[PDB]
Structure 1
Amino acid sequence: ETPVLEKNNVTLTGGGENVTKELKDKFTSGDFTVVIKYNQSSEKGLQALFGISNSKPGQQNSYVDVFLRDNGELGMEARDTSSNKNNLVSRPASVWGKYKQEAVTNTVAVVADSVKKTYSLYANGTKVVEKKVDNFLNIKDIKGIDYYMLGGVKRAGKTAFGFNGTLENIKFFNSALDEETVKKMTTNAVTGHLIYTANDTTGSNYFRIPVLYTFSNGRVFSSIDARYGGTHDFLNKINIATSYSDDNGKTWTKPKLTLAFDDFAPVPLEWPREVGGRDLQISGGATYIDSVIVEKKNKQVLMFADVMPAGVSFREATRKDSGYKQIDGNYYLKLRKQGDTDYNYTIRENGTVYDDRTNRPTEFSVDKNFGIKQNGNYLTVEQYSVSFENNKKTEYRNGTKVHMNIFYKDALFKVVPTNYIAYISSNDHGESWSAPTLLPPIMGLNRNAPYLGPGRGIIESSTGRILIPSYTGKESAFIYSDDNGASWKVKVVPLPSSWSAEAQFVELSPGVIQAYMRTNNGKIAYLTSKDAGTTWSAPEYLKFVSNPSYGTQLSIINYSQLIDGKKAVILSTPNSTNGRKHGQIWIGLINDDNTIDWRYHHDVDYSNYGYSYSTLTELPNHEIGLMFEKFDSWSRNELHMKNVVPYITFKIEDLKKNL
């Protein structure tokens, strides 16, 4: 199947190029596919990569185009003046702008298929949207088309939406090419920056909350939320997926499901993005959410995550019950048997379920992965699948039998409906993992567990104390161990307001650590401890970041090499009052007095491009790895998008900019 027109290396600065002679009436059926490999010299303004129009006076609403906005949105219009049909199909955060001071080459495409009445858009190997529209228009359906141009749309004799950049290759086909063909044709260097991809070995269409960590042996390890029912925090099904690289981030393993429940199948779901429909959630599967990684002194790796029973949201989790009882000085996870109103049971030694009323063992036991047995035999429940089609979400028992689990809605014995924290450990640097351990009720018996601050933990150098950042909604909770992770304690620090205080730590000098965190006031806060985390200062605030009141997670790390003769820290955060946008990486140099000279920054892409949760690591070669949400993950307009969490590498010289 061959193009009706192909052009190469057309450099434009807003004025466009007429190709009317070379396209006139070639779109015989009216269907079309246009594949455009381009880079932009300037991202400002609404820019059309091509335009097919009626250029006559009064016919300015008779055109087809593919467009780019200054926030990375890719779209198309197909409009006819006399029928008054105006189609616009798009997705935010579809393209890249610039990377390391150079324009990025993207390959995008549009397919219009009259038989299906769908428009489809592709960007860098991903079909970003396909939408069926009742008012479908093909080229033949638009009256009096007389002008075909590159890099603009001719409207009433004037060039609209002028493109600034180079069309490296543009191909026009007079038919609807098939999806696999167009995915391949749009695949390029940008595609290779995705570690996790929609419907890869995780089965998830969507991801959020990336974490990077470099282990002592040189392995670069990642974890992430695989969020199956769109990108909603809750209600959803979420697993923690992992992937690693043993060549300094150049190649990565096929993702694995590392923390996952099986009450719901991990399946690819087409979550709706329309107003209204996008608020849809599933009934809720048992969930792991928001991972934290640390490597211990002995090279064992710990991963922590929040644990939510099926159907329980952060918002409805009870705050007044830990889910534990204390019996004879020991903390045991408590259970309510279906039909009871009280929690009459506890999981004691060897997972044996005791009746607390009689203080005797029952026939039931719970294994280390939370599965329920009766008389030594597993109880089972039927797994749920979720499906769509006719714009209708259906959940149903799917014929698969899985072990009954205390976190599931169909369990005979159930935990308190609140949030918990679990950790797992690995002795082979992430290739295999232990069973989970739930944290004991370190906040007290009558409080829920803290919520983890996604990213990493640290080992403070002078004491060997392990620190894990978390928060409660009104306090900071610095979880810690002084016995190399055998047992855990917490320092609870009240905050000026009800911050979602996702935090990360850095060590300035031995015994001196700072916790940088999200607030509800627009600023990034930092608290300082001079006794390895036992006591903390009042908050201070970075002066150079100004964000919206909701705030965003951040990443900050220590860096191992001197910069300008000084020890350095590296910070990643959005910096915009208009959304989760304008990502920056900042270098902070530690002064002799333990203040920080925030001397350099580098903008990640253009300032209106999306940038939400992020994670930094120092690669073994002392380059910097970054993985981030390249979209606004707060915005109700950017929910449920595929293939938007990339990985990029920087040298320090790429970062040492702007002073």
Structure 2
Amino acid sequence: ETPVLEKNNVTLTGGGENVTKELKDKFTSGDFTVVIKYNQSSEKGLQALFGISNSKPGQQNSYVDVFLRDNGELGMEARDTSSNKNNLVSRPASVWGKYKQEAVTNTVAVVADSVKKTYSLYANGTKVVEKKVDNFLNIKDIKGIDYYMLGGVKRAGKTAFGFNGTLENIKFFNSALDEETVKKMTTNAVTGHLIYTANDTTGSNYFRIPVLYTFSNGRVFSSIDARYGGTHDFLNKINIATSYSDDNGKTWTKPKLTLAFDDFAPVPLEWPREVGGRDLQISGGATYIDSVIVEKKNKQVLMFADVMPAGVSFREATRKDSGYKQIDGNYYLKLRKQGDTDYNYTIRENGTVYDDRTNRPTEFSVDKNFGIKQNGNYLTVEQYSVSFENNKKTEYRNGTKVHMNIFYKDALFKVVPTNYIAYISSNDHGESWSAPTLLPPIMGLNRNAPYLGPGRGIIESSTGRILIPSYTGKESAFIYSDDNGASWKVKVVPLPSSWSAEAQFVELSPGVIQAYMRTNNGKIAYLTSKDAGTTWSAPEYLKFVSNPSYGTQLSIINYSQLIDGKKAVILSTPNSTNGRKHGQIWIGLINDDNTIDWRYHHDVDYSNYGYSYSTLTELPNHEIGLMFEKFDSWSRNELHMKNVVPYITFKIEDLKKNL
């Protein structure tokens, strides 16, 4: 309940402060909790917030500490020289470094619990890790502890891991405080930058692929992947969740599930992060993934997403079948009934399922949310849950009956196991949505649908054409409507190599459009159209971004206000050959000849901090909103982490840097 020691406002420059006299032998049980509110003046090197050690020659592997790395990783050590027990518990991407040129105040904590044999670490309101270890050490288990310090570890008479910064408040407790208390204690201004959080109203512990859009009524809208079984692209269960703000991004609605299947329950799952287990996946729930948003000229809002039947992955999907038949000039989604070899059925007018062999209606039908009926009554299946008690994953039928659905593995009639694109519409700026509409097979009957480029669509100003970015793995696929979204066509552009070409558009001048996109060669590519997306140039490449060959998604938007007398675009991307890190926001000024002068940039946090997928929007007051993956979402070391997708705002003056 009350600390054995509390200190305030201790500024350090790598030297530490001895507090041995104020801690000596105060950890009676040997358990501990230490809560540290701090900021770093420099991020370089491994830095300890505190160190409790045997400082004598030869005992340099007898200490407890909590530490920070230059990549945002928070960890702790607990080591005993004589028994050769060496415990290290941590999670990447746990803290923030700097924000708009200034040191961020974080609050972190460590709890050591002898009865549970666990070490737990907390950062800004989140329990980032709790790990049971066989070789558990408490302070009494480490022999001859004799030195207690702030801002380093005393090892063989010298200070190691010197902290550079201010310890604004540090509290030491001689017991293991409970989780709700410590979450509360660590909650601060950083916590308020999370819109989506682990086990909120989505039920997901994990999130990826954020998207931001500002509507013409001033509402700021966000969408994201709620990924339940860790952060895996596949196999997984994924829903699209949404949340909005009516006050310029200051406060946000409780998240809602907007696109969601219910073959698997949306539940918080503890996905393992060890080298064995982290590769584990569920068997696969039907999935929506990778959202794109656009507002039409009439103020209707459209959201697109990829749709995946349960158990099917992007890599295994058949690329030789659209999942449609053409019968009497119309495109009908086709179905295979359990036990049949061929696809003998189609969904036709009113959702009536026809037997294509006899060309007559069956007693079965499919509603607009893909649920299956027989004689006007719904068929049901049992929903699955996943549990992880210790180390063993189990999937089981959970007692809930849900509507049978053509995307589920337990359905009597099933779609082709490939990918599809769906869209929904809203007439109330995101408060409610229509039932989904599957795109027709615009790639051809014998090709799979494209994969969407997460972010936004645009309306080209001179023609009114709606453009939706997508890709196939070998080509760009620019999806478009010329009839205000009643029907859809595609422009397919072959690419120099097999890019995962996630793309976004900007308009330079009336009729002139650029598509900026991810590649497999380390650069960001851009293609240019001078006829509103009908024809496209060969790729050009940005000169100042150099990334790994796998690449990352980007965000680029038009900005409404003049910067230095010029129309501007704003770009967000990682920029680093060592991983998804060194996030930058760039400002491009459109020249008279429609080339771009990339004149300014701002680094988002320090350069070794993680930065993956991102999304930009212009707020109603002309500030900029950014939401991004503040971690490396490619790296096998940073999978399955909670509360790592923050929202932040910038004034143009915050971005106009590095001339």
Report if TM-score (shorter chain) is over 0.5. Answer: yes
Question: What do you get for the CA RMSD once the two structures are aligned?
Answer: 0.3
Distance 2:367 2:612 in 1: 38
What is the match of residue 116 of structure 1?
116
Instruction: Quote the offset at 1:373 in angstroms.
Output: 0.2
The CA deviation at 1:390 is 2.0
> For each residue in 1:360-402, what CA deviation from the matched residue of structure 2 results, as whole angstroms up to 9, or x when unmatched?
0000000000000000000000000000112111100000000
Shift of 1:307: 0.1
In 2, Cα distance between equivalents of 1:326 and 1:595: 45
1:233 shift after superposition: 0.3
CA distance in 2: counterparts of 1:394 and 1:242, whole angstroms: 29
Q: In structure 2, how many angstroms separate the alpha carbons of the residues matched to 1:586 and 1:329? A: 49
SS of 1:636's equivalent? coil
2:129 partner SS: strand
SS in 1 for 2:30: coil
Q: Distance in 1 between matches of 2:255 and 2:565?
A: 39
Give 1:389's aligned residue.
389
Cα deviation per residue 1:486-538 (whole Å; 9 max; x = unaligned)? 00000000000000000000000000000000000000000000000000000
- Secondary structure of residue in 2 paired with 1:462: coil
- Residue 278 of structure 1 aligns to a residue whose secondary structure is helix
User: Secondary structure of 1:402's match?
Assistant: strand
Name the structure 2 match of 1:429. 429
Once the two structures are superposed, what CA deviation does each residue of 1:100-157 show, in whole Å capped at 9, x if it has no partner? 0000000000000000000000000000000000000000000110000000000000
C-alpha distance in 2 between matches for 1:13 and 1:576: 29
Q: Secondary structure of 1:182's match? A: helix
Q: For 1:16 and 1:453, how far apart are their aligned partners in 2?
A: 49
Other structure's SS at 1:204 match: coil
2:156 maps to: 156
What is the rounded CA distance, in whole Å, between the counterparts of 2:492 and 2:137 in structure 1? 61
Superposition deviation, residue 621 in structure 1: 0.2
Give the Cα–Cα distance (whole angstroms) in 2 for the partners of residues 355 and 264 of structure 1: 30
Q: Give 1:11's aligned residue.
A: 11
Structure 1 residue runs of 4 or more that deviate by more than 3 Å after TM superposition: none
Following the alignment from structure 1 to structure 2, what is the Cα–Cα distance between the partners of residues 640 and 272? Answer: 8
Structure 2 distance, partners of 1:549, 1:18, is 48
1:549-582 deviation per Cα after TM superposition (whole angstroms, max 9, x unaligned): 0000000000000000000000000000000000
What CA deviation, in whole Å up to 9, does each residue of 1:163-188 have, x standing for no partner?
Answer: 00000000000000000000000000
Q: Deviations over 1:18-54 (max 9, x none)?
A: 0000000000000000000000000000000000000
Partner of 1:47: 47
Secondary structure, counterpart of 1:519 in structure 2: coil
What do residues 390-425 of structure 1 show as CA deviations (whole Å, max 9, x unaligned)? Answer: 211110000000000000000000000000000000
SS of 1:318's partner is: coil
3-state SS in 2 of match to 1:235: coil
Q: What is the rounded CA distance, in whole Å, between the counterparts of 2:566 and 2:468 in structure 1?
A: 26
1:471 Cα shift? 0.3
Name the SS of the counterpart of 2:184 in structure 1.
helix
Residue correspondence of structure 1 range 130-209 to structure 2 within 5 A: 130-209=130-209
Q: Which residue of 1 aligns with 2:414?
A: 414
Q: Secondary structure at the match of 2:251?
A: coil
Give deviations 1:34-87, integer Å, cap 9, x for gaps: 000000000000000000000000100000000000000000000000000000
Structure 1 residue 657: deviation in Å?
A: 0.2
Q: Secondary structure at the match of 2:183?
A: helix
Alignment partner, residue 240 of structure 1: 240
> Given the alignment of the two structures, is residue 321 of structure 1 paired with residue 321 of structure 2, yes or no?
yes
Three-state SS of the structure 1 residue aligned to 2:22 is helix
Distance 1:30 1:212 in 2: 48
Instruction: Indicate the SS of the match to 1:364.
Output: strand
Quick one: distance in 1 between partners of 2:49 and 2:446? 60
Q: 1:220-239: CA deviations, max 9, x gaps?
A: 00000000000000000000
CA–CA distance in structure 2, aligned partners of residues 32 and 398 of structure 1: 40
CA shift digits 1:178-217 (9 cap, x unpaired): 0000000000000000000000000000000000000000
Question: 1 CA distance for matches of 2:314 and 2:53?
Answer: 51
TM-score normalized by the length of structure 1 = 1.00
Measure, in 2, the Cα distance between the counterparts of 1:474 and 1:140: 61
Distance 2:217 2:341 in 1: 51
In structure 2, what is the Cα distance between the partners aligned to 1:438 and 1:267? 27
CA–CA separation in structure 2 for the residues paired with 1:497 and 1:563: 36
Alignment of 1:533-548 (within 5 A): 533-548=533-548
Structure 2: how far apart are the matches of 1:136 and 1:581?
34
Paired residue secondary structure (1:184): helix
Distance, in Å, in 1 between the alignment partners of 2:188 and 2:611 is 22
Distance 2:206 2:652 in 1: 31
Aligned-partner Cα distance in 2 for 1:252–1:581 = 27
Residue matched to 2:356: 356
How far apart are the structure 2 equivalents of 1:20 and 1:484? 72
Q: What runs of 5+ residues in structure 2 fail to find an aligned partner? A: none
Provide the C-alpha distance between the structure 1 equivalents of 2:380 and 2:615, rounded to a whole number of angstroms.
39
**Deviation string, structure 1 residues 279-324 (Cα, Å, up to 9, x no partner):** 0000000000000000000000000000000000001010000000
The C-alpha deviation readout for 1:616-643, integer Å capped at 9, x for no partner, is: 0000000000000000000000000000
Aligned equivalents of 2:351, 2:616: Cα separation in 1 = 39
User: Partners in 1 of 2:448 and 2:125 — Cα distance?
Assistant: 43
- Per the alignment, residue 89 of structure 1 pairs with 89
Tell me by how many angstroms 1:276 deviates.
1.4
* Partners of 1:321 and 1:56 in 2: CA distance: 71
Q: Report matched runs for 1:108-507 at 5 Å.
A: 108-507=108-507
| Alpha-carbon separation, structure 2, partners of 1:423 and 1:557 | 22
Give the distance between the partners of 2:136 and 2:512, measured in 1 at CA.
Answer: 63
Structure 2 residue matching 1:409: 3-state secondary structure: coil
Q: Residue deviations 1:435-488, cap 9 Å, x none?
A: 000000000000000000000000000000000000000000000000000000
The count of aligned residue pairs is 659
Distance (Å, rounded) in 1 between the aligned partners of 2:103 and 2:654: 15
Distance in 2 of aligned mates of 1:631 and 1:337: 44
For 1:634 and 1:11, the matched residues in 2 are separated by 37
Question: 1:240-275, CA deviations, whole angstroms, 9 ceiling, x for partnerless residues?
Answer: 000000000000000000000000000000000000
2:42 is paired with a residue whose SS is coil
Aligned position for 1:625: 625
Distance 1:358 1:319 in 2: 28
Q: Matches of 1:308 and 1:556 in 2, distance apart?
A: 27
Distance in 1 (CA, whole Å) between partners of 2:341 and 2:481 is 36
Gaps of 5+ in 1: none
Residues in 1 aligned to 2:492 and 2:326: alpha-carbon distance in whole angstroms: 21
* Cα separation, 2, equivalents of 1:435 and 1:188: 39
Q: Secondary structure at the match of 2:303?
A: strand
- What is the CA–CA distance in structure 2 between the aligned matches of 1:472 and 1:276, rounded to whole Å? 32
SS in 2 for 1:21: helix
1:81, 1:69 → 2: CA distance? 24
Q: CA deviation at 1:586?
A: 0.1
Q: Aligned equivalents of 1:10 and 1:453: distance in 2?
A: 48
Matched position secondary structure for 1:654:
helix
- What is the distance in 2 between the residues matched to 1:576 and 1:325? 46
